[PDB]
Amino acid sequence: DLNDAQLKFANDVESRIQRRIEAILSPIVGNGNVHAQVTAQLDFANKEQTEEHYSPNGDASKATLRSRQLNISEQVPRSTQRNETSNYEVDRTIRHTKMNVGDIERLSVAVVVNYKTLPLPLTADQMKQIEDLTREAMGFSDKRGDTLNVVNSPFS
Amino acid sequence: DLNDAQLKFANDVESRIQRRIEAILSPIVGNGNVHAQVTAQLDFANKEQTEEHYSPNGDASKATLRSRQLNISEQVPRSTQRNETSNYEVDRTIRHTKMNVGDIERLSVAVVVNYKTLPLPLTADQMKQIEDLTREAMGFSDKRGDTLNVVNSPFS
Amino acid sequence: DLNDAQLKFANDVESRIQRRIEAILSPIVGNGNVHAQVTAQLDFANKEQTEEHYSPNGDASKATLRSRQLNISEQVPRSTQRNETSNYEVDRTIRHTKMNVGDIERLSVAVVVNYKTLPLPLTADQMKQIEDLTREAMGFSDKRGDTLNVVNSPFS
Amino acid sequence: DLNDAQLKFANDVESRIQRRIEAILSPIVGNGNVHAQVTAQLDFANKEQTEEHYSPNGDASKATLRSRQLNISEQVPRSTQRNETSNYEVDRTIRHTKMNVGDIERLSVAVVVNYKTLPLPLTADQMKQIEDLTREAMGFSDKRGDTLNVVNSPFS
């Protein structure tokens, strides 16, 4: 029963993205001269993370001391001694996070644009504008790994 | 059921932003000569953080002492001794934070502007003013990573 | 009873992918001039993972110390001694994940395209566009190992 | 009673594969000019696995230390001493998996293609296309060890 819920959730996400793309693209080319299909991958795994960090204190001008002992001796046959003990206080940061189930991982979008009749193919600048608008509509992210493909061809 | 609530919340946020953009842009170009689409990414993860910091006390003019012992000896064959023990009091700061679920992470906005009929394209200065107004309306933030694209093209 | 549920889930996934491919391809070649078949492999195993990592502290400028003892002696027959003891604080990260049952592992898709009658085979550019659109529709992933095969042949 | 369930499950899997192959192959050669038979081997054993791994720390630039003692002496008859004790923190990964009962291990498929009447045997290119489509339909995997055999012969 959970798998069916996952399928319906994915379908809802894809339908919302497709509706947004159609809404933004309709005023330019026409009401029924564009079609789009969206496929999405979703993460349904449970993840938790805990991170702990400390700041370096190797520099004497940055360390914080709590107690220190220092003994120095010298006899002049030359003899020299030096004993040192130190205790430090350190800066510590802890973060705990629990990830959300149902996030998007990757998107792939294909768009088909009808020819203009006044059978003449669209110009390159119009195709570039259409691609830019579609990229904005999909929330394109290079880090995620999304793919987009737009094809201009006459409709049957 | 939670995922549907997340979807409706995202839709509400996007609709509010779109309504604001349309409201600010309508008086300049016209009532029905502009369209906008907004897509948003939201963070639905639970995060907590604790930070602890100390101030450095390596400078003798900044340290705070609680007790100190100092023994010095000298015999004149030259002999010299020096024993020192010190205890410090330090300044400490602690901060605890719990993040809010449902914050915005990134925004992408696409706007289409109709041609002016008195078929003449709009001037560059008008496009710059429109872009500035849209940037103000979206709450543009360079740190967040928002993207905006405005296209001037005749409407079908 | 579980195996029948797995079979029906796989059939639903394949049917959804086939429907998407047919929907994207229909406007270009025609309503009834394309057929597609999809077979999918699904992972129905239960997996859990725990990962723990530490940051290196071999560099003296990156380590965080809690206490340190250092004794140095020298008599001048030349004698030299040096005793050192140190205690460190380290950065540690822990992650726990539980995988989702029912994920896709591999996809194989076969498409047949009808000849154009105005018996003339389709051009190479049209075949390339069809292949690109199908690749977008299937959510093709090279890492997963998907396979696609498109054949242009007259229909009986 | 379990063995009968295993037999019916295997029959269902084989019937689904045969139906897919017939559906993809019918539009090209004809409605009743192709037959296929599928036999499958299934794994009905219960298996569990646990894996544990550690990262190497032989490089001094990658190790993480918790405490270290180092004593050095030298008298100049030349005498030299060096005592060292070290304690490490290591990265550890644990994975636990439980396999799914009822997976496919190997497939064998035989197909017979009828002669074309306009008694003329089919061309080599058509046979290659049929083989490629069948390979896509069966989800052929070289690692699994599947076998396919297609024969073109007149029907009685």
How would you portray this structure in words?
This is part of a larger assembly, with four copies of chain A (156 residues). Chain A has 156 residues and is of the alpha+beta class. Helices cover 28% and strands 42% of the residues of chain A. In chain A, the strands form three sheets. Chain A has a three-stranded mixed sheet, with helices on one face. In chain A, strand 6, helix 2 and strand 7 (147-152) form a beta-alpha-beta unit. In chain A, helix 1 runs antiparallel to helix 2. The two termini of chain A are 40 Å apart. The interface between A and B is large, with 52 and 51 residues. Chains A, B, C, D: One of its GO terms (cellular component) is bacterial-type flagellum basal body, MS ring. Chains A, B, C, D: One of its GO terms (biological process) is bacterial-type flagellum-dependent cell motility. Chains A, B, C, D: Belongs to the FliF family. Chains A, B, C, D: Keywords: Bacterial flagellum, Cell inner membrane, Cell membrane, Membrane, Transmembrane, Transmembrane helix. Chains A, B, C, D: It is found in: Cell inner membrane; Bacterial flagellum basal body.
What is this structure's SSE topology?
The structure is cut from a larger assembly and holds 4 copies of chain A (156 residues).
Chain A: H1 2-29, E1 34-43, E2 46-54, E3 64-75, E4 79-89, E5 92-98, E6 103-113, H2 124-138, E7 147-152
Parallel strand pairs in A: 6-7
Antiparallel strand pairs in A: 1-6, 2-5, 3-4
Helix pairs in contact in A: 1-2
Function (chains A, B, C, D): The M ring may be actively involved in energy transduction.
Biased composition (Polar residues) (chains A, B, C, D): 77-88
Protein name (chains A, B, C, D): Flagellar M-ring protein
